[PDB]
């Protein structure tokens, strides 16, 4: 079986920065896709960002450019998120997805942007 456990939640004031990552097990992170989603309360799943395999490319959404940064590593076989200048509308539960239209999605982390 494949695990996609993740961690990096916390309570932090607006304009701070967190440390988010997905612990990928059973597959090399450099060989498949990667994606990112949030489900803010009162809203639905929203696409955030994606990084291809072997660093082919990385594209963002309208509220991700210039604010968030996502990187990868090979030693720990994980995908890591960095962010700054957080705003109250960013309060959401973030879900890690291994591939587009893929059956392997993580448990999710709860991150709060307290104005």
């Amino acid at each position: 079986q494949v695990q996609l456990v993740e961690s990096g939640g916390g309570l932090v004031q607006a304009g701070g920065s967190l440390r988010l990552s997905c612990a990928a097990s059973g597959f090399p992170v450099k060989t498949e896709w990667m994606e990112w989603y949030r489900q803010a309360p009162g809203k639905e799943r929203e696409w955030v960002a994606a990084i291809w395999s072997y660093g082919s490319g990385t594209r963002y959404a309208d509220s991700v450019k210039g604010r968030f940064t996502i990187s990868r590593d090979n030693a720990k076989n994980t995908v890591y998120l960095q962010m700054n200048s957080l705003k109250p509308e960013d309060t959401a539960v973030y879900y890690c997805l291994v591939r587009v239209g893929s059956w392997y999605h993580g448990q999710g982390t709860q991150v709060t942007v307290s104005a």
Partner: protein, 502 residues
Amino acid sequence: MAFNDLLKQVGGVGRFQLIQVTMVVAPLLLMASHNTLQNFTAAIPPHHCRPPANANLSKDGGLEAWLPLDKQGQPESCLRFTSTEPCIDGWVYDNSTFPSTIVTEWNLVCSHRAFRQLAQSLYMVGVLLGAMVFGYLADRLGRRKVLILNYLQTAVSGTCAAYAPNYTVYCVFRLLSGMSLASIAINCMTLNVEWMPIHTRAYVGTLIGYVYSLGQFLLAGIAYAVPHWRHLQLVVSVPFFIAFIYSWFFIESARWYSSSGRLDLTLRALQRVARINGKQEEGAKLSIEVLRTSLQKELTSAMELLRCPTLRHLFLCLSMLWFATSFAYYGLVMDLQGFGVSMYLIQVIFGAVDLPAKFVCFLVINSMGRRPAQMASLLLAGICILVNGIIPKSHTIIRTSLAVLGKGCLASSFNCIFLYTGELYPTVIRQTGLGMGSTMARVGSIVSPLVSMTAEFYPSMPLFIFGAVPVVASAVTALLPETLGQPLPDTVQDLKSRSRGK
């Protein structure tokens, strides 16, 4: 004293040789339109999985939650989220530019997307089957009768394909449409060249090419006017019906009539052609006793072609050339949706580029020769479409210009290979050689959709195969001798002497 003697005696420029020729070559416009139509009647519009009706779109934050996205900012065209799972509730197609296409009607997307190209493959299978079977039937039975039958079958198959309930019905009716269409295409040319003197065959060929280019123009315009596929197929097939209604005034081929060993009806046809031409004083002397005295010298296949080593080698080479040229040409023509620009404009440019390319190859063959023209045209076409395959979608104008140059190069290559096989094969087996070359060209046009079938592997590999084939053909056709000096061999003895004497 021969058939040409009588034909010149009756005329050659009179009203008959214009009216009959123009009537029989009018449907070549729809020839081109029907051959290319699959591009316009089966264009894939942007599409995505449909969220289930039970789910509330308003309460789920819109359709963006149920549709995973790809790189180009569009929803995924085959998958959907489970709150994954493939399409199970159908599909959603935008109507911004396509009211309806066969892919829109019968959801030939994601899984079982092969059918939108299997349809063209089956149509080309029908073309080849009709060509060979109805060539045999025309040899056995006649020309006017088989051409009329092809007219009717084409019209019926076009209408039936326009109104097709299922998909297998559509494929079978396309197969029968090709069955009739190859036969009409070959028989129009054979009747025109059999009812004209020797020194007008080049004129007939040039007119056929001009009508084909005008057919490309007409298809572009008719696609601009009528976007709906159900209306488009019917509107492009009903003029065949009106031409079948008005094509009962055709005059059968007198040469084939004389070739049957019987001459009374041949005399009747020649008398009729004298009446319509308006020249009766000169045609009065025509009677039975002059037919035998004028037509007696000429009265007196695969196995022999494959037996002789020189004949076998010449076959293999020419078959490879025809196969590669037709394969690449139809692979390039059948795919114009993925060029960025509107299909109508690129189709217009493809049609327009025919005449300048024809002038270029004519100048080259009348100036330098044929084999260098083959090399240049094939190599340039292969390189151009390979670069098209290697240039990403982000660039549009350069890709379209490269595709236009490639289409022009393929047209010039077609004209050049026709002339080269005309002035290459010995007169003993020249007609059978042309038939085999045409059959191999139809085989290549059959395979081309099969090659484009497997684009699921790589995004642009079919373009790579289309660009790899003609470079191989040009490399392997190097050994072929050049016939600029007009040797015009008759039997296999001349070929070996000419090759040794070259």
